[PDB]
Design a protein around this nucleic acid. Structure first.
Ligand SMILES: [Zn+2]
Ligand SMILES: [Zn+2]
Ligand SMILES: [Zn+2]
Ligand SMILES: [Zn+2]
Ligand SMILES: [Zn+2]
Ligand SMILES: [Zn+2]
Ligand SMILES: [Zn+2]
Ligand SMILES: [Zn+2]
Ligand SMILES: [Zn+2]
Ligand SMILES: [Zn+2]
Length: 281
DNA sequence: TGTGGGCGTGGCACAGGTAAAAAGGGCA
DNA sequence: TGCCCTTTTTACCTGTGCCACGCCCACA
């Protein structure tokens, strides 16, 4: 198992990213270097290190002079003061947001103009940044550096290994306020909550009924068209969705999966066993 | 009574956009 | 060494493909 896969071939310290490792390996390469206490990262100025340490210490020295709210970073206080009057404001020409200086207004407005300079060598797609392109390389690489300490299962993101380990331990800390069913991660709870909202953004143009997912709209449209693109290799049957084919194929394998006490009848589905449980109640 | 497909949603490993943190640095 | 920013990396967020259940109804 490895929640931090990027290990130093010089000291063995563990880091969750190549970038973080890269800025630790200053300790052993750079002559003029400044290392942090517990996290073991290095910086090329005391200014920088001391700034970084406020992450551990929780100090917030940059204090607003008229409302008094402290902040961790000059970055942050600078954005805050846009809220009071008498601040140099960089309003977005298009949307409604506002930025403290010009370099970040420019970076935002890359989201309108669609500029994506770092072009992927393989699919030719583009990204707002080098580290994003690095992220997208998961698609061509199929690597899984994050590894479960219980089963050694592989994951592309430490996020996902986290949710998996929560699954192992049965830790579902996201509860649906209305229903009560819990969830290992935040996306699962989000898609569920869509059932209470009635947030069904995909609408059948023909019929009118609305769905949660794009795939359901597809399967509905084909269920009006009659197109069943999923064929059995053995018996030649048709299906609209792959799950119905996969569940079908268990008829071809001898299964006899479930059974009932004192008569032993075998049913391919679990719910069938209930229907037969009604017989002798 | 027994089958079995259509339908709707849960589990899960996952990509990609953007808001936010975090690092980089010229210079007084 | 902090100002005053620029630039890079990460968190937060929202959507998605594939697979499998349980439910409802049509028939056999
Ligand atoms: Zn090292
Ligand atoms: Zn640190
Ligand atoms: Zn204020
Ligand atoms: Zn805008
Ligand atoms: Zn690519
Ligand atoms: Zn595991
Ligand atoms: Zn609920
Ligand atoms: Zn329809
Ligand atoms: Zn078949
Ligand atoms: Zn029985």
């Amino acid at each position: 198992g490895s929640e931090k896969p990027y290990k130093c071939q010089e000291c063995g310290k563990a880091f969750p990213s190549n970038a973080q490792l890269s800025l630790h390996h200053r300790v052993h390469t750079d002559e003029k270097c400044f290392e942090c206490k517990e996290c073991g990262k290095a910086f090329m100025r005391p200014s920088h290190l001391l700034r970084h340490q406020r992450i551990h210490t929780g100090e917030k020295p940059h204090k607003c002079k008229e409302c008094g709210k402290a902040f961790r970073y000059d970055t942050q206080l600078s954005l805050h003061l846009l809220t009071h009057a008498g601040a140099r404001r960089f309003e977005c020409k298009d949307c409604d947001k506002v930025y403290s200086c010009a370099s970040q207004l420019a970076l935002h407005q890359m989201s309108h103009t669609g500029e994506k300079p770092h072009k992927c060598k393989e699919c030719g797609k583009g990204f707002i940044s080098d580290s994003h392109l690095l992220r997208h390389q998961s698609v061509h690489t199929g690597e899984t550096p994050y590894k479960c300490k219980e089963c050694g299962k592989g994951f592309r993101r430490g996020s996902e290994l986290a949710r998996h380990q929560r699954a192992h331990s049965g830790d579902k800390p996201y509860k649906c306020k209305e229903c009560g069913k819990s969830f290992t991660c935040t996306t699962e709870l989000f898609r569920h909550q869509k059932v209470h909202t009635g947030d069904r953004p995909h609408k059948c143009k023909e019929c009118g009924k609305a769905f949660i997912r794009r795939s359901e709209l597809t399967h509905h449209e084909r269920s009006h068209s009659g197109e069943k693109p999923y064929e059995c290799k053995e018996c030649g049957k048709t299906f609209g969705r792959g799950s119905e084919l996969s569940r079908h194929q268990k008829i071809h394998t001898g299964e006899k999966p479930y059974k009932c006490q004192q008569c032993g009848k075998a049913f391919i589905r679990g719910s069938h066993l209930t229907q037969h449980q009604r017989i002798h109640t």
